[PDB]
Amino acid sequence: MARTGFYTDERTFWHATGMQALFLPVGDWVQPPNGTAGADTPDSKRRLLNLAHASGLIRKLTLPEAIPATVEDVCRVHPRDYIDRFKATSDAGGGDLGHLAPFSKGGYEIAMLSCGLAIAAVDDVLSGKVDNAYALCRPAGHHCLADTPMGFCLLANIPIAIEAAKARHGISRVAVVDWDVHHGNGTQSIFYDRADVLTISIHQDRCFPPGYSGAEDRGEGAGLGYNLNVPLPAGAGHDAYVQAFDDIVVPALDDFKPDLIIVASGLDANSVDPLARMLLHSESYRLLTQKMLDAAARLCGGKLVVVHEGGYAEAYVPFCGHALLEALSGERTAVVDPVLEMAEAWQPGPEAAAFHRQWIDRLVADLGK
Amino acid sequence: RTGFYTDERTFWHATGMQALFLPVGDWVQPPNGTAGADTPDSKRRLLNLAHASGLIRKLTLPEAIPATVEDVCRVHPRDYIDRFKATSDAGGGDLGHLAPFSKGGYEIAMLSCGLAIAAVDDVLSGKVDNAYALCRPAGHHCLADTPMGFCLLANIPIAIEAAKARHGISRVAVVDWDVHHGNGTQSIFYDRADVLTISIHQDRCFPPGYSGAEDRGEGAGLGYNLNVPLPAGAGHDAYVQAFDDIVVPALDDFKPDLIIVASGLDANSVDPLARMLLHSESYRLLTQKMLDAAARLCGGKLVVVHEGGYAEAYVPFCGHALLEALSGERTAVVDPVLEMAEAWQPGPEAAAFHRQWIDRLVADLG
Amino acid sequence: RTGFYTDERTFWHATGMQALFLPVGDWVQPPNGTAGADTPDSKRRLLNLAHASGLIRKLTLPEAIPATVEDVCRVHPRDYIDRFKATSDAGGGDLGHLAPFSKGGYEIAMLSCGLAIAAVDDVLSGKVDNAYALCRPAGHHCLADTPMGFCLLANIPIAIEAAKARHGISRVAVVDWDVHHGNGTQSIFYDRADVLTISIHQDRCFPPGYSGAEDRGEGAGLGYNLNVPLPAGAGHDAYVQAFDDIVVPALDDFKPDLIIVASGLDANSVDPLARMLLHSESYRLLTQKMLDAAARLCGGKLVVVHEGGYAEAYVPFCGHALLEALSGERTAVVDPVLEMAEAWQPGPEAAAFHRQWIDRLVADLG
Amino acid sequence: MARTGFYTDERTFWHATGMQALFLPVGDWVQPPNGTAGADTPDSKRRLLNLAHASGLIRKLTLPEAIPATVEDVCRVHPRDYIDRFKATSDAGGGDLGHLAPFSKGGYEIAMLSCGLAIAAVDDVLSGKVDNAYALCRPAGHHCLADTPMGFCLLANIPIAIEAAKARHGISRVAVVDWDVHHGNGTQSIFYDRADVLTISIHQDRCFPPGYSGAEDRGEGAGLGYNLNVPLPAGAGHDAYVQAFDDIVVPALDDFKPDLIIVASGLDANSVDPLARMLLHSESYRLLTQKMLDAAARLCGGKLVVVHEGGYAEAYVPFCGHALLEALSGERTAVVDPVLEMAEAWQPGPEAAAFHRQWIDRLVADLG
Ligand SMILES: CCCCCCCC(=O)O
Ligand SMILES: CCCCCCCC(=O)O
Ligand SMILES: CCCCCCCC(=O)O
Ligand SMILES: CCCCCCCC(=O)O
Ligand SMILES: [K+]
Ligand SMILES: [K+]
Ligand SMILES: [K+]
Ligand SMILES: [K+]
Ligand SMILES: [K+]
Ligand SMILES: [K+]
Ligand SMILES: [K+]
Ligand SMILES: [K+]
Ligand SMILES: [K+]
Ligand SMILES: [K+]
Ligand SMILES: [Zn+2]
Ligand SMILES: [Zn+2]
Ligand SMILES: [Zn+2]
Ligand SMILES: [Zn+2]
């Protein structure tokens, strides 16, 4: 089988965004929460790992102990001035150096560690240590610009791991498939004029960054044709996503011939996420991972790396990620999703489904069909 | 004069140890934070903001008086009420489909129901011009013999049958803009022409898989039930068009003597239990559409009854703009989500699909 | 008539992301539940229980009047107040020792203080016979220029100084039965004989390591400060003897024109921030001692001001019985812990020890 | 000090007592909690393991996979009828079959799992796979009677582990030192007429079971002299516990000559626990662990097993248990207890200290 590496560190759950009601700073008209503070909560990620323990799936993976990102690693993407300001704010108690990117004292070390998980997953897959990998990163990365953190991302996890890999393995072509429900503006920005990294984002139309769709932003200069935005209307679900993957994502991968596929895996397109309006369920994520596994076996020797990003529904994220992990490792457990049959009843009916198919066919046509 | 019907103990109702709406055990790990989905704070926080803004001081807050056994038995069989009380006395349970409650939840449900009775009664007797009943537990999914979907008693139907007994009211219209289908209201009045039941809801959401546009009543009630399913991901302009093209015309045709809104706030843009895109100004505007209809059709007699709403951070701003509109007051509250939620709204291609969807609903109505 | 002074926004003060009182970072993992130790609910649940019992119906609730900067500057230097406001605008912080606050904590601290000002004002003016101010943030650890121990303004000192300016009251006694030493009150009036400051507190608890029996005032204030430290693990009978043999005799000798009690409820038997064994009826009986003293010494003028109290589940029953005595009102509330808390009380050998300890304090007072 | 087994399972953190405010059942006058429900909360135990991970301590220990207790196991202590009703209620959604022992659907499986942690820890120490062991038990066990669960204890973890050891190794003499702040009434009861298990309990006088002190309850029959209660007054702290251990607990162990020492380790005597009134701090638990390590080394070839019981301060329990684990494993980390200085300042002064010493002097005198 594909021995799957699972990259996690306890301290990633000790990152805390501060006293917010969901994503809202307390202060003014926003009453502080009486329960868990924040939206990126520790349990919105730890509960996935908890469920993988309870099912026994965790014992079927290998869990290496990753070293943190070094300053040299992260400075292949970020300017040292950002990194120095980040560390100094963190040493002094935390803050927010960007757009909705709050952190607490010592958040700098936890982000370097989070980043180390994605570096390690990429490094170990390229070295053959494992056949494929899942990095349970927290804080996430796919919104972080070179000099600006945003949307709960403090470092550019996947870009940093890619740049390390080019330095240590000389890898020529990398494709990033971002199915976190929000646009991967960070990844898009960092490689926008580069043709060696193909950046694909599937995301809810206009959600985050608010108002942005991006299907005509396809790259610049040498990177023209190497960025691919797939916005999908709010309220799209399982059949829409798999059509998008069959008709856009997978052919673009086939065209590009990567030497490595990386999934920026947010789980926030799930049917009860507060931070988006999509209708994916656990089996959606199993099937999308299988398409990525098949593509990687066909294109780059099974070299597939999944890097956790967003996902905010503490009760349902575990089941979506666990089905993903089952696919990735080719293992099956006794876990049954208690929401699955309701999520299937919830899916768009025939009138909405023809609209999603019309919407995706136009994206295809607009790309040169 | 706006009356505001609330009682501290509606916040003491507790659905038990669920992760969101998932009963714990087997593969569901217990929540480390607040248990459940219908949490006390997902309703209390609206009242807290009405206090913090000074709005609540411009409203009249009468003391709650629970529904009686006689009140609730106008709708429910005595056997259900009896099993409910006995299960509650022995520590709680669930007598339906996703309707859990704890010890003493029976009395809290009778108290919650009483808020709706009194809101309707006081408006009909002109003690106040309109009214808002902060019900918890909610009511619009509860069937005559079966509680459902966090609804233990049929709050609005009980209030209506009380109104018929106490005031002899002839025509009532219920407009249910909670994001789930008002199956409880629909069923209880399905064969009656004196109560027009309107439900605007996310297509196929709860009850799961139900759309319902063809279900327009039976017998004497044929033509007096009106389901308006909207697709997941619909937002402000879709709801406005549905009210302009379906809901408000249906009211003008029916000529009610009282309008009740079953007001869930769970169509809000960050709610976990639906996929819709309404924001606080949506609720302000739909409330003004009901105020206008009430002034036009029944001397301004409007009652708003709280049902769902599960985003504890954003529900308060939606319901507070509703309350401003209802009271005709205007506070300093600024919705910190409004700009982003407006940015989130469906773009042209999605907006065209919503408009085509609603146009077809209108057409199907003959 | 008992006036009850409270405002929704006092429950919006947040101390930030701490596990209990431990700032997050380094080896302290963020809490998954409610953050902090001075949590909103550790105070709001007292108000909730008084609504649920009907007791709140029997009291008068004046609208809150925030403290003015002129009020607070009768105790604090203006520079402190300006730095406090600027730090709160910039998003909060901590300007003292264990006194964190979030953005907007300045306004809420000013509100909280206005509750104690008003409660004292309305009793002196005869609008109510006695009063309870549900202050949050608390006040009695705050120094003139240094906030401490969750206390951002010196609520009771400010209230006293407003009272001297508006009414010219001559003699005020403050009885501090919060379980921590009232070091703020002690320091502010230490060289003054017009305010007698008494503090009963767990030996060495907060400020840590302080006992203080020999600290009796200075200059004209000599003999007008009275510390009563009590060993960890003392309970109902120990406190009763301390009040009978020390506190009440000191009130008799002093002849106050007003009694104010700084009532933290953190000496209760399950509080995390102290080791004492008081129960709900302990607070009812200690309030009756203060009521009888006030009746006998100053025409029944008694103000109770909320300080600390951190056991969310049990603080409501302690404060509710206090309010019952304060108002002379009966409810059906029953403390479901009382029998157990009575069984937990120190046995005979410990009780002889507590009696010997208190006898020594009596003797040392000369 | 040694190669230390650490016995934990993720599902022990999935046991939920239900919708209580602290230990008070919601309903009537008790308002539901908005934060974490209950007193025995998952995090009041998990946070110890989380810190042992974050410190790197976990990487120096051995973590065997969990082996649940079998029904045969638990029925060496409990009548099968109790176990079957427990199973039937757990399947039907949970309940409470005793006194303050509530549980949710599937709580039976998790109690069987938790018990297995103690069984395996004892087994592995006796068979020599590890020199000492820590069992992160949840639910706890030391209040559970043979037919009556109580005080958040659904199975008699430590008794069941001792009877398994007897059945599998023939062990003659076991001492249990219960320093959980509450009386170990379950262990006392099960072994009350037996001379082969010396049961020692140090606890807050009159705390739980409420009103109970127990110094004069020394066993019966063949068990006379083989149960030892050390009630301590509420408000006792570090120096009182030290004296109790030097003057009573360690002398008892030396007379009894155990072949195995089991510590029932609740951490609820820490200085901020809601469910007791004691003033222990992290270094108290380190030193008490050293005392038991030295007794195990002198009396039974270092065979020492520490079984988690109570502990309810989710912010401070981790530092107390982490210093415990440092002593058990003999591994140092960079963990610094942020509360320690203050808790030292909190400790009883000279007048209360003299009361605690004469109290303990009185207990020693009554022994004989
Ligand atoms: C403004 C709220 C939108 C979510 C921001 C973080 C998105 C992500 O998880 O990638
Ligand atoms: C999604 C499963 C539960 C839905 C309950 C709907 C209750 C409401 O109308 O607020
Ligand atoms: C860090 C020690 C906690 C004690 C501070 C609380 C003060 C009070 O409630 O009066
Ligand atoms: C009711 C207060 C005490 C609860 C009993 C649990 C004691 C323990 O942790 O052993
Ligand atoms: K690119
Ligand atoms: K994306
Ligand atoms: K209804
Ligand atoms: K509806
Ligand atoms: K009808
Ligand atoms: K003071
Ligand atoms: K005091
Ligand atoms: K003085
Ligand atoms: K004990
Ligand atoms: K024995
Ligand atoms: Zn996302
Ligand atoms: Zn709803
Ligand atoms: Zn205090
Ligand atoms: Zn205990």
UniProtKB/TrEMBL annotation, chains B, C:
Gene Ontology molecular function terms on file: histone deacetylase activity; hydrolase activity; metal ion binding
InterPro entries with a match to the protein in the record: HDACs (IPR000286), His_deacetylse_dom (IPR023801), His_deacetylse_dom_sf (IPR037138), Ureohydrolase_dom_sf (IPR023696)
Domain Histone deacetylase per the UniProt entry, residue ranges: 44-324
Transmembrane intervals: none
Pfam entry (one): Hist_deacetyl
GO BP field: epigenetic regulation of gene expression
Binding residue positions for Zn(2+): D178, H180, D266
Keyword terms: Hydrolase, Metal-binding, Zinc
PANTHER family in the record: HISTONE DEACETYLASE HDAC1, HISTONE DEACETYLASE HDAC1-RELATED
Family of the protein in this entry: Belongs to the histone deacetylase family.
Protein name: Dimethoate hydrolase
Originating organism: Rhizorhabdus wittichii (strain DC-6 / KACC 16600)
